[PDB]
Scaffold this active site. Structure first.
Site, short mmCIF file in Angstrom:
data_model
loop_
_atom_site.label_atom_id
_atom_site.label_comp_id
_atom_site.label_asym_id
_atom_site.label_seq_id
_atom_site.Cartn_x
_atom_site.Cartn_y
_atom_site.Cartn_z
CD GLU A 369 2.29 -8.08 -1.54
OE1 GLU A 369 2.47 -8.04 -2.77
OE2 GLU A 369 1.17 -8.19 -1.01
NE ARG A 385 2.81 -4.35 -4.32
CZ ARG A 385 1.53 -4.70 -4.22
NH1 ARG A 385 1.20 -5.96 -3.95
NH2 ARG A 385 0.58 -3.80 -4.41
NE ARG A 449 -1.94 -6.26 -8.87
CZ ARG A 449 -2.11 -6.26 -7.56
NH1 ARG A 449 -2.92 -7.14 -6.98
NH2 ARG A 449 -1.46 -5.37 -6.81
#
Length: 511
Positions: A369, A385, A449
């Site tokens: 990504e 990414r 995250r």
């Protein structure tokens, strides 16, 4: 006695929001936490606050390791039956106040357990409060068994839950993208994951939320792209996901690019995708356009044969958003799995306002990504990414991807846990600071995250000395940025309080 003010968004559309978490470490059995006073800052608009309520949660499990400010999540972001108020089975309301003065006293009467006891204060805002409201509060005193035991700076910000789990009978929503139309409207795009939060393949459509008042209100969801029953196959075998959205800027056309998987049972597309060109052979690269500010969407346009190399297992856009370049070129980030199942990030572009598209060369191996922004006129910066882990890869191209040049920030300056990230460029003439600007948002960590943070750079991405923490909690982490106007940034991201959370923040609060 400790008090934690969690840096998480206060949602206008919620009936409860965690303002203070209170842990009483070693209480005497029977002692009453009789009162608790929260004092708002002098600049806080009390008219924006609708309600304040004190909750008593229970005690703690004996083997739970560490300092904890709650025994359980009080307000769920995943319970499709209630994502907007506190679960009554975890929190017992002790008192609620609707007359919000500069100081508000809350009472309890609860006898209290020997050892750990949990309390917390919830705040409900007026649904029309400004999304730019900054809320400064503190617990000025606490009274326990007649004594004013000691209590011992957090600026809270508002948000709006554009999509909650269960909204419109969809189990989950993911992969946010955000842009601003030529008329000032905000277009929020995302996966509509009906049956669960699992990736393709599954019943997934591309949904659109539209706001014409800078995010204060959002119009009902629209399905901008769907292949539910294309060849009589189950809609669960006709999913489309990972959308990317852009505004042409000259034409005003809104474009959504998404990947359509056909068949594939109930398996994951990332590992089951195989080479070829046809829909049954390999996932298809699809476009949908809106020429009326995002209100109406065209039938899908299939551009697979325009840009896909037959030997690739999988070609899809980089989720989030795209851009218009100064010279009018439309650009999306893309990623493809090659014949050996090695992923590469790159860019796809159109010089004729979306009628035809082209891909040149991959920027870097083992990346997926990415988001692209024009740091300097004619210079595209691809922020990727990277599966190697720990840090975003950064490369720049002056020929639309024929050749790529490493940036000094590459694998260094922007840490990540390997997760989608958003990058946008804001020219000096389009922001209140009068300087070329980069804005970047991702989970500001190397593992896990959480800690969604907007970062700003004033020297083309070499240095990022400005940052704004938005979300302490854990989330799925994806985010997308746009400029609402010259003074304010907008972010649509997956937060710990809503699957698709919108927040607005003054550029001057970051820089």
């Amino acid at each position: 006695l400790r008090i934690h003010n969690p840096q998480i968004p206060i949602l206008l559309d919620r009936m409860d929001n965690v303002l203070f978490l209170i842990r009483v470490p070693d209480a005497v059995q029977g002692n009453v936490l009789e009162s608790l006073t929260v004092e708002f800052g002098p600049d806080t608009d009390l008219n924006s606050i609708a309600e304040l309520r004190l909750f008593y949660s229970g005690t703690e499990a004996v083997r739970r390791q560490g300092l904890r400010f709650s025994p359980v999540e009080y307000i769920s972001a995943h319970n499709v039956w209630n994502t907007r108020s506190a679960n009554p089975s975890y929190s017992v309301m002790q008192e609620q106040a609707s007359k919000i003065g500069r100081k508000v006293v809350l009472h309890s009467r609860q006898p209290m357990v020997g050892g750990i006891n949990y309390y917390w204060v919830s705040v409900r805002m007026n649904p029309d409060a400004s999304l730019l409201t900054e809320l400064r509060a503190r617990v000025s005193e606490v009274v326990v068994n007649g004594k004013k035991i000691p209590v011992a700076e957090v600026v809270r910000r508002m948000g709006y839950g554009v999509r909650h789990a269960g909204d419109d009978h969809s189990m989950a929503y993911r992969i946010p993208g955000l842009v601003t139309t030529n008329s000032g409207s905000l277009i929020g795009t995302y996966d509509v994951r009906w049956n669960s939060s699992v990736d393709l393949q599954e019943r997934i459509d591309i949904g659109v939320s539209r706001s014409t008042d800078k995010g204060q209100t959002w119009e009902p969801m629209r399905i901008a792209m769907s292949f539910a029953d294309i060849d009589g196959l189950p809609s669960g075998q006709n999913g489309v996901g990972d959308p990317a959205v852009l505004v042409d800027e000259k034409t005003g056309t809104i474009w959504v690019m998404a990947a359509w998987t056909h068949g594939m049972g109930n398996g994951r597309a990332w590992t089951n995708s195989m080479p070829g060109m046809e829909p049954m052979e390999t996932p298809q690269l699809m476009l949908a356009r809106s020429d009326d500010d995002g209100r109406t969407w065209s039938e899908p346009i299939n551009i697979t044969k325009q840009v896909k190399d037959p030997s690739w297992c999988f070609l899809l856009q980089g989720p989030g958003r795209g851009i218009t370049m100064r010279d009018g070129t439309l650009v999306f980030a893309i990623q493809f799995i090659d014949k050996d199942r090695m992923p590469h990030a790159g860019i796809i572009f159109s010089k004729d306002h979306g009628e035809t598209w082209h891909i040149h060369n991959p920027a870097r191996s083992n990346t997926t990504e990415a988001q692209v922004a024009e740091v300097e006129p004619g210079v595209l910066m691809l922020n990727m990414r990277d599966n190697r882990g720990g840090a975003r890869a950064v490369m720049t191209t002056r020929d639309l991807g024929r050749t790529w040049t490493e940036h000094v920030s590459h694998r260094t300056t922007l840490r990540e846990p390997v997760c989608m990230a958003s990058l946008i460029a804001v020219p000096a003439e389009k922001n209140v600071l009068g300087k070329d600007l980069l804005l970047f948002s991702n989970p500001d960590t190397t593992d896990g995250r959480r800690d969604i943070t907007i970062k700003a750079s004033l020297d083309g991405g070499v240095t990022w000395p400005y940052s704004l923490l938005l979300d302490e909690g854990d989330s799925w982490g994806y985010s997308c940025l746009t400029m609402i106007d010259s003074q304010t940034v907008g972010i649509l991201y997956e937060s710990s309080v809503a699957h698709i959370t919108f927040q607005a923040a003054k550029l001057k609060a970051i820089v």
